[PDB]
Each structure stands twice: as C-alpha cells, then as structure tokens.
Design a binder for this molecule. Structure first.
Ligand SMILES: *O=P([O])([O])OP([O])(=O)O[C][C]1O[C](N2[C]=[N+]([C])C3=C2N=C([N])[N]C3=O)[C]([O])[C]1[O]
Ligand SMILES: Nc1ncnc2c1ncn2[C@@H]1O[C@H](CSCC[C@H](N)C(=O)O)[C@@H](O)[C@H]1O
Ligand SMILES: [Mg+2]
Ligand SMILES: [Mg+2]
Ligand SMILES: [Zn+2]
Ligand SMILES: [Zn+2]
Length: 852
RNA sequence: AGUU
C-alpha cells in the first residue's frame, strides 16, 4: 500500500504556512550565505561560492562518497556551485557545465575562484536534448519539485533515464528528487545492479524535500535508506522545533590553477627516518590511502585514530548572564561556532594551507637576499646569537607561560635522554622524531622537538632581538598599552599615509627563498651552535613532516604529509622569523615605492647590487623607524604615497594582501587612531587632569564574545568564574574607557569571591603581559601601568578615584560597538545587582565585596 | 532543486 514517503508528502502539504516555515528547517544543517551574497551583489569574483550548492557538494566530496577526477561533466550546473567547487579538487583536470538558462532558469555566474581556467559553463544547453559524452565524473543536480508525488515521480524517472547513458565506470553524484515512489525505487534498483553505488541523504537538504543522492562510491539497500529518511522527516514533524545548525560557507580561493605545478617533491633522504618511525609506532593500523585529498603536500601514509574536536565551544556561564543584552547580538554569539572537528580542519587545510606560491622572479630574489643579509647584520650589531639550555627551557615551562604534563616531562630525566639522542642525530645531519601537528608517549618526541628548536633559535625571543631598541621596526616586549603610543610617534614622521595591509595567510606565503634568507642568521653563530641551528633550518623548517586528522567514511585517520616551504605555525621563533621577513618585505616595498626598485629590476636576471646596498646603508634604518612590525602584522608610513601603488615586488614575493584585488592600490590612514594593528586601534584620551592617555580598543562585541568562552571547565563553576574574573580585570586595565565593559567589570568582580585566584589564559597574545592577575586593588595596578611606568606620561601625578579615569566619548564609544543609548542596556544597567546576586547564589556563600 |  501507501509508502512512508507518500504519508510524509500528504502531511507536508497540510501544514499552515507558518507551521511549514518552521518544519522546513527544523534540525537541518544550513550554510551562512550572508557574506557570499553581498560579495556577489558587489560583483566580487573571488573566494565566494556562487550558491548553496558548493556547500552541498562539499559534504559528499568530504566523505569520499564521490571523488571528482579527470574531466568532470556537470549536468544542470545552474549558477555553477558544483562546477566551481570541483575545479579545486586534486584529481580534477577539466569541468564542463551544461545548464538550460533562459527565463525562470539559473544562468551560470562567471567567477575568478581557484581553477576558473578549467571551468566551462554553457547556457542554452538543455541536457535532455544532449548526446552523452565521455567523462570521468558525472554530476547532476536536476530536480524540479512538485506538490504532486506522481508528478515528481515521472520527473525523477525522466532524469534517471536521461542520465544513465552518461554512466560508464566513472564517478558520479546524481540527485534523485523523489526516491520514495515505488516505480522510482524499482528503477533505482535496476540502476544499482548495473552501475553500483547507493542513495544518500544530505543533511543540508531541507525537510520540505525528500531528495536523496545516488553516489557511486557506496553500497547499501536502497529501500532501507529511503525509508530511513522518511521516518526522520516524519519524526521532525512532531519533534520540538530545532534552530538549524549553521556551518561556515566554503572559500573557493582565487586565480588560475596549473595542475602540473601543484605536486610536491619530497626529500626522502631528509624526511624518511621520521616517516619510518611513525610507521612502526602505528604499524597495526598503518596504510596508504590513494584517496587522500592533498594537492600540494606530499602524502606518505595514514593510521587510524579516535576523533578529536568540536563544532562549537563551551560558553562561560558567569559572563553570559551578567551580559544579558549580548545574548541576542549575532557578532558575540558567533565566535563559538569555530569548528575543530576533523571535517572543519580538513576544510581549512584545503582552502588556506593546501596552496602553492609561484617562485619569485630572479630580481626579486636578489633584492630579498641583499636586504636580508643587511638586516641580519643590523640585528646582530650589539647582540650575539646564543644557545639556550635545558635549565632555561625548564624554568620557562614551570612558569607555565591545562598543559601540566609539560612540567612533568622536563623534570623527567628520561625525557632529556631522548632529547640528547635526537640532538646527536642533528649533529650528523639526520632527524628522527621531529614532527609537528595541526589540531606509547609520543608526547616526549614532541616536547623534545620543541626544545631543540628553543635550544637553537630560542635566543631570538629570549634575548629580545625584535624589540624596538634592537630592530627599530619591532615591538617585542611592548604590550597593548604601549602599542598605540608607538603608532602616534610614527605618525609624527613626515611623509605619506600610514598603511596597514594584512597578508592573506602569511605563514602559507613563506617561500623557499624566505626560508633561505631567514637561515642566514646562522652565519653569526659559534660553530657548535651553527651546527644545531643548521639542523633545525634544513631538516625541520625546510622539510616539515606533519600529522593531520582526516574524516573517512570508515573512521578517522591520521595523515602523514610533508612540505618543503611555508611556515610551521607551531614552531619556536615563528614570531621572530615572521617579523624578520615582514620587516624585509616592507623595506622591499618601500624601495619600489621610492623608485629605487623597478619592474625591470625584478625581471632582470643579474640585478646590480650597488644600488640596493646604497639605499640600505644610507636610508635603511630611517625606513625601519617608519614601521611597526609585529610578526605578520605591519604598519608602514613611507616618505610619500607612491607606496600605495607599489605592488609589483610585494605580490611577486608571494605576500598577497587580504580582501583586496591583487593590483588595486592600497588605502591608508592619516589619523593614526584609526590604524589597525595587532587586532586593535588606539584612541587618545584626555583626562580631566589634562594629561593624555593612548588606550587600546576594538569592536566591543568581539571583546565580550571571547569572555563568554571557557577553556575549558566541563563543568566547573568554581573555575569558570576565575576565567571570567581574569577577563574582568583585563577589561579594567586595558578597556576601562568602554562604558559597558567597565560596568560589566564591576558586575563580575562583585559577583566573584575576593581572594579567589584568577587563572587560565585570557588571551595568549605576545603583547598581553597579563599584569591583571594579582588580587590587588585595580586602581593601584592601573596607576602603575598608565602613570608611573608609562614612558609617555611625564607628570607622574597618581589617580585617586575611578572617575579620574576617562571614558571614550559617547559618540566614539558607540561607534566601537557600545550598547549605551539602547534602553535594553539601561534595563541591564539597573538589573545587574540582581544578576550579581544571582551568580553569588549560584556559586555559594563566600567572601564578596561590592563593585556595583 | 537553485534563486529571494
Ligand atoms: O524543496 P524545497 O526545500 O525547496 O521546498 P519547496 O518550497 O520548493 O517545496 C517543496 C514542497 O514543499 C511543499 N510546499 C511548498 N510551499 C510553498 C508550501 C508547501 N507545503 C505547505 N503545507 N505550505 C506551503 O506554503 C510542496 O509539496 C512542495 O512540493
Ligand atoms: N532540462 C535542463 N537542462 C539543463 N539544465 C536544466 C534543465 N532543467 C533544469 N536545469 C537547471 O538545473 C539546475 C538545478 S539546481 C542546480 C544548482 C547547482 N547544483 C549549483 O550548485 O549551483 C537549475 O538551476 C536549472 O536551471
Ligand atoms: Mg593589521
Ligand atoms: Mg524548492
Ligand atoms: Zn629531529
Ligand atoms: Zn575604539
């Protein structure tokens, strides 16, 4: 008789328009298309997925249900979501899209996303009038819905009969609009006997459609899976309404794809021993997956592993309810949906890490060489490089700036025996166990590899090589409270505007030549030190072996991959080396801006050195003082504004700017208070004394958003509060000028016990000196930071009350996201005594004293 | 189904 899909249909068509509206998305997975749909309106052709379809297809490609390869044919491509996504897949060489177009139908949208040069979409091409072509991958998403099941039925069969002749021992993913009608089930079964595969439900599909997808890589009972969907959809009628799960939309990159230029060539004599050891520490589940996704990293093998990560983050209770208005604001409640699930990370690797930078021109390479040799010499004018020791490393661990096996390990004499063993390999130019991650005690191998880095390259951070005194451009050991002052001093330097261009994924943009230039520091080292440093550079920085997780349809596996260039982001002195190359890169760009370095010079194979040496030796230091370089973050105030147009060398060096077309001139500021740097801008405040403060500031919502997050007590109240009181005291020392934050700060500290220890990292930022931890009176701590220890505060007159500590002007406070003025803020302002009384009751009966 |  009647099928469960048909019962579902009849009941779907009986819902009210508002009962259907809720059912349509109850418990489904959706994609955030807001950013993409406004990029499309602004006519942007990069990064954006052209429709919801790219994310839909991704779900299948993720689980290898279909693995597009060779020539891909996309029947009914529409705007081209599936076609644009396939263009960036490893084994894909060509994509052809056929769609009907015309009135009432989707026309393909031209894009410049990565691999556009192998995509060919055509309108005026009805596939039901089209002779089948040879292809290695057949996609089809055609399915015109209907409130009549039997109408949907014949439409589905029409699609099926159309599409069958395209199938011939090739990959395929085909939408089956209505799969529960008996005759379709019948036809699918005959199809499954001939071409194999299986029907699968996509979680991104709305509950208002029964659509399933016939994919080639799978086997299973058709009737069973269809009826499972039927029950699920039928269940979601009566289940209490669930707000859909929201994913982050796909990033399809930009630029042409040269498939032959992607594959990595591994130095097996360098990385072989490391692989071998991984292989036999996990020999029981070790295998080689030919279906690995890596385009530009060299794959070596895999072993099985239990899954790690979450799609969302644990919210802090104490703050969440002391900040009731922000329960509703989107920007705050969104930084929880960061996803570190195997899927989430494999997505990140594809779009951000699995890329390859073209080798810079010979002229560009010479410039970087000359500049680096000079820069290194400048950085070592007073200091010598030095080795760091076990004693030094151990002390740094015990001052744990919970990684707690860290303090156990260094005390283990057995741990250091392994370290010694590995060091003797490095002296012979070999590496056995230096592998890092992206996320039986293999833990020792990893704390040991970090130490050896620290031993050889730790001096850069510990001896403050990139402090402002030593590097002019640098800002190491300064802190948020000092950064804004440095920007204000820079603005006093005559010239062009202040430019702050962010590189897109800096660490992935580090090149072979960058690595070879940072390496030059070893020339200043003692022999025994150079030996160890040369081992670090050559064997582990220029030959990286990485463990990375990957979800598969039969479990999670750990992939072992390798890469010669790029930067290992989890390495010692990543900050310093980033700062160095960025300093060099910005000097290079200043030369081009000043006309010293021309297009002819970058292309010219033998660039005469005399010109660049002269510029550096006469102007270099002055130009370094025009900059503030913190790792990959820079602020540059050149001698004029030609710099904004100086783009040849910067792009050729691989340091492509973020969120701007590759050849569009940079836009800078002349108001230094609007310059972004280290995730902040900096306001100048006038105390009613008359003296001036330069405070750090940022969008208030991302300050509040971070503080509604634990790290990570599940579920400990007498520890989740101590994280909140840490934020609350940071807000007091650093963001006192914000009205909501300072008020919220007084609402937290009065709600949390007086001498309860504040722990856990607030932010692990290099410029966060964390001097807000002591359970000391905040005004006295504030006074030491902003008055007596402040070099830019001449009059050391102390502050006796919190009303001599200024705010931002209401206008400027509001512009930075403050909710003052909104009456919900007012109701919140007079309800925080209760909210305070709430958590104090939620904690218990202990030492409170009021900051109300 | 995609588009709002
Ligand atoms: O397949 P979609 O997710 O994209 O959903 P839709 O809107 O095209 O139509 C699918 C089925 O859902 C039913 N439908 C459509 N509308 C606008 C309504 C309904 N059902 C009810 N009770 N009220 C509606 O307004 C149709 O059966 C349609 O085939
Ligand atoms: N007979 C036909 N021949 C070619 N294309 C057709 C067709 N009938 C419908 N189509 C197109 O097929 C599309 C199905 S929706 C496909 C969207 C696509 N998967 C994406 O990710 O963007 C519709 O846009 C429709 O215009
Ligand atoms: Mg910046
Ligand atoms: Mg629809
Ligand atoms: Zn090693
Ligand atoms: Zn601000």
């Amino acid at each position: 008789g009647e099928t469960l899909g048909e019962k579902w249909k009849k009941k779907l068509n009986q819902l009210s328009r508002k009962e259907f509206d809720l059912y349509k998305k109850s418990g489904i997975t959706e994609v955030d298309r807001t950013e993409a749909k406004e990029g499309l309106k602004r006519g942007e052709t990069t990064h954006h997925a052209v429709s919801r379809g790219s994310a839909k297809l991704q779900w299948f490609v993720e689980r290898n249900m279909v693995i597009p390869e060779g020539r891909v044919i996309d029947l009914g491509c529409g705007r081209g979501g599936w076609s644009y996504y396939c263009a960036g897949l490893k084994k894909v060489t060509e994509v052809r899209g056929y769609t009907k177009g015309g009135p009432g139908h989707e026309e393909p949208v031209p894009m410049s996303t990565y691999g556009w040069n192998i995509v060919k979409l055509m309108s005026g091409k009805d596939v039901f009038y089209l002779p089948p072509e040879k292809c290695d991958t057949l996609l089809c998403d055609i399915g015109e819905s209907s409130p009549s099941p039997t109408v949907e039925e014949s439409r589905t069969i029409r699609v099926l009969k159309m599409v069958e002749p395209w199938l011939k021992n090739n990959q395929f993913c085909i939408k089956v609009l209505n799969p529960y009608m008996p005759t379709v089930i019948e036809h699918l079964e005959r199809l499954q006997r001939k071409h194999g595969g299986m029907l699968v439900r996509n979680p991104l599909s709305r509950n208002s459609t029964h659509e399933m997808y016939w994919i080639s890589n799978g086997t299973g009972n058709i009737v069973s899976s269809v009826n499972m969907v039927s029950r699920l959809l039928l269940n979601r009628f009566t289940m209490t309404h669930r707000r859909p799960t929201i994913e982050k939309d796909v990033d399809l990159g930009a630029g042409t794809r040269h498939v032959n230029a992607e594959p990595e060539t591994p130095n097996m004599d360098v990385i072989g021993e490391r692989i071998k050891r991984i292989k036999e520490e996990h020999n029981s589940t070790w295998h080689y997956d030919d279906e690995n996704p890596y385009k530009t990293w060299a794959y070596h093998g895999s072993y099985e592993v239990k899954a790690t990560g979450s799609a969302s983050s644990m919210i802090n209770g104490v703050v969440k309810l002391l900040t009731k208005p922000w329960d509703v604001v989107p920007m705050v409640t969104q930084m929880a949906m960061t996803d570190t699930t195997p899927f989430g990370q494999q997505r990140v690797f594809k779009e951000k890490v699995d890329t390859r930078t073209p080798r810079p021109l010979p002229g560009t390479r010479k410039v970087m060489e000359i500049t680096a040799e000079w820069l290194w010499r400048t950085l070592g004018r007073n200091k010598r490089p030095r080795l760091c020791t076990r004693e030094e490393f151990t002390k740094k661990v015990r001052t744990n700036a919970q990684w707690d096996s860290a303090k156990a390990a260094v005390e283990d004499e057995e741990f250091w025996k392994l370290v010694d063993r590995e060091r003797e390999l490095h002296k012979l130019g070999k590496c056995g166990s230096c592998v890092y991650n992206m996320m039986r005690a293999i833990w020792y191998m990893w704390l040991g590899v970090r130490y050896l880095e620290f031993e050889a390259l730790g001096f850069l951070n510990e001896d403050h090589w990139f402090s402002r005194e030593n590097s002019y451009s640098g800002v190491e050991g300064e802190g948020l409270h000092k950064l804004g002052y440095i920007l204000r001093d820079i603005s006093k330097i005559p010239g062009g505007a202040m430019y702050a261009d962010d590189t897109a994924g800096w660490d992935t943009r580090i090149t072979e030549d960058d690595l070879h230039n940072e390496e030059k520091i070893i020339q200043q080292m003692d022999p025994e030190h150079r030996q160890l440093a040369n081992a670090i550079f050559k064997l582990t920085y220029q030959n990286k072996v990485v463990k990375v997780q990957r979800p598969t349809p039969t479990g999670t596996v750990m992939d072992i991959i390798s890469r010669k260039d790029q930067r290992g982001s989890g390495q010692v002195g990543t900050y310093g080396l980033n700062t160095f190359t960025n300093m060099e890169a910005q000097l290079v760009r200043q030369m081009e801006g000043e006309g010293v370095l021309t297009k002819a010079d970058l292309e010219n194979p033998h660039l005469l050195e005399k010109k660049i040496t002269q510029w550096l030796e006469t102007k270099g230091v002055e130009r370094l003082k025009r900059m503030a370089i913190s790792g990959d973050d820079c602020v540059v105030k050149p001698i004029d504004d030609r710099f904004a147009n100086a783009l040849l060398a910067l792009n050729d060096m691989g340091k492509v700017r973020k969120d701007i077309p590759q050849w569009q001139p940079s836009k800078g500021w002349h108001d230094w208070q609007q310059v972004p740097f280290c995730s902040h801008h900096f306001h100048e405040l006038i105390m009613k004394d008359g003296r001036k403060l330069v405070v750090p500031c940022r969008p208030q919502d991302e300050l509040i958003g971070r503080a509604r997050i634990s790290q990570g007590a599940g579920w400990s109240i007498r520890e989740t509060a101590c994280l909140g009181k840490a934020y609350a005291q940071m807000w007091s020392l650093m963001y006192f000028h914000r009205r909501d934050l300072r008020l919220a700060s007084n609402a937290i500290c009065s709600a949390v016990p007086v001498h309860w220890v504040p722990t856990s990292r607030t932010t692990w930022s290099i410029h966060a000196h964390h001097q807000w931890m002591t359970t000391e009176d905040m005004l006295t701590v504030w006074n030491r930071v902003w008055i007596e220890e402040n070099p830019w505060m001449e009059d050391k007159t102390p502050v006796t009350t919190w009303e001599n500590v200024p705010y931002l002007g209401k206008r400027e406070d509001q512009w930075c996201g403050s909710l003052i003025g909104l009456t919900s803020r007012a109701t919140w302002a007079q309800n925080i005594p209760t909210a305070i009384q709430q958590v104090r009751s939620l904690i218990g009966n202990e030492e409170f004293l009021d900051y109300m």
